[PDB]
Design a protein around this ligand. Structure first.
Ligand SMILES: CCCCCCCCCCCCCCCCCC(=O)OC[C@H](COP(=O)([O-])OCC(O)COP(=O)([O-])OC[C@@H](COC(=O)CCCCCCCCCCCCCCCCC)OC(=O)CCCCCCCCCCCCCCCCC)OC(=O)CCCCCCCCCCCCCCCCC
Ligand SMILES: CCCCCCCCCCCCCCCC(=O)OC[C@H](COP(=O)(O)O)OC(=O)CCCCCCCCCCCCCCC
Ligand SMILES: CCCCCCCCCCCCO[C@@H]1O[C@H](CO)[C@@H](O[C@H]2O[C@H](CO)[C@@H](O)[C@H](O)[C@H]2O)[C@H](O)[C@H]1O
Ligand SMILES: COCCOCCOCCOc1ccc(C(C)(C)CC(C)(C)C)cc1
Lengths: 68, 53
């Protein structure tokens, strides 16, 4: 279906690929290495519960007053 | 203006230079072993990682 050149990636000679840099002494920085810096929110979860309650309540209050 | 006895001095100079070069170029960087570089080799395993202690 396809010639061997397309599969192996070269017609005659296999060219050397420059390897990937590492940046010794620190973590890799890639699109997939970002969870090292940004975990899921874990610090303000209970504050999230409180603020969700208060937001619901205040919205309901002002909406009911407006409607009435 | 260059006698033939002065040639091996020049050859010695250039030998010193190229030896100072090759003692550095003889060194090469080995394979990386930092786990942070290879953590995705284990993340992508066909089974979840067992933290066994
Ligand atoms: C239920 C649907 C998902 C159930 C299972 C999935 C799951 O819960 O995963 C956690 C999932 C996401 O994880 P998370 O990081 O903890 O999310 C933060 C919470 O949404 C942050 O909100 P919260 O759940 O921590 O507390 C908000 C609080 C607020 O209480 C109120 O005032 C609401 C009153 C309603 C009447 O509501 C309640 O806890 C219980 C009252 C009923 C809601 O949270 C939920 O989906 C459950 C709450 C969602 C409520 C609105 C859904 C629309
Ligand atoms: C908007 C910013 C995206 C937040 C993604 C959170 C994260 O760090 O990213 C982490 C998540 C994966 O979470 P998990 O490791 O728990 O599976 O996605 C990624 O790994 C890369 C997201 C790239 C898109 C950036 C936008
Ligand atoms: C089957 C019925 C008949 C139809 C046959 C033709 C079907 C063609 C559709 C499938 C195409 C797949 O296309 C595929 O593309 C990749 C790109 O990642 C090529 O990949 C090639 O190039 C990359 C870089 O670009 C090289 O590093 C690699 O070594 C080499 O394989 C594959 O050689 C080719 O096979
Ligand atoms: C809207 O999205 C914003 C996109 O921009 C992201 C901004 O990123 C800048 C982050 O700045 C830093 C720099 C260093 C760090 C350190 C190295 C201090 C974090 C550490 C110690 C956890 C590794 C954290 C954040």
């Amino acid at each position: 279906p396809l010639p061997n050149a397309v599969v192996q990636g070269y017609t005659s000679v296999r060219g050397p690929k420059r390897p990937l840099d590492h940046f010794y002494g620190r973590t890799p920085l890639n699109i997939d290495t970002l969870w090292h810096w940004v975990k899921f929110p874990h610090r303000y979860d209970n504050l999230r519960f409180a603020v969700c309650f208060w937001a619901f309540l205040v919205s309901a209050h002002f909406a009911n007053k407006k409607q009435r | 203006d260059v006698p033939i006895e002065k040639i091996p001095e020049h050859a010695n100079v250039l030998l010193k230079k190229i030896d100072a070069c090759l003692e550095i170029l003889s060194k090469d960087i080995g394979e990386v072993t930092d786990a942070e570089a290879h953590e995705m080799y284990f993340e992508t395993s066909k089974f979840q990682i067992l933290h066994i202690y």
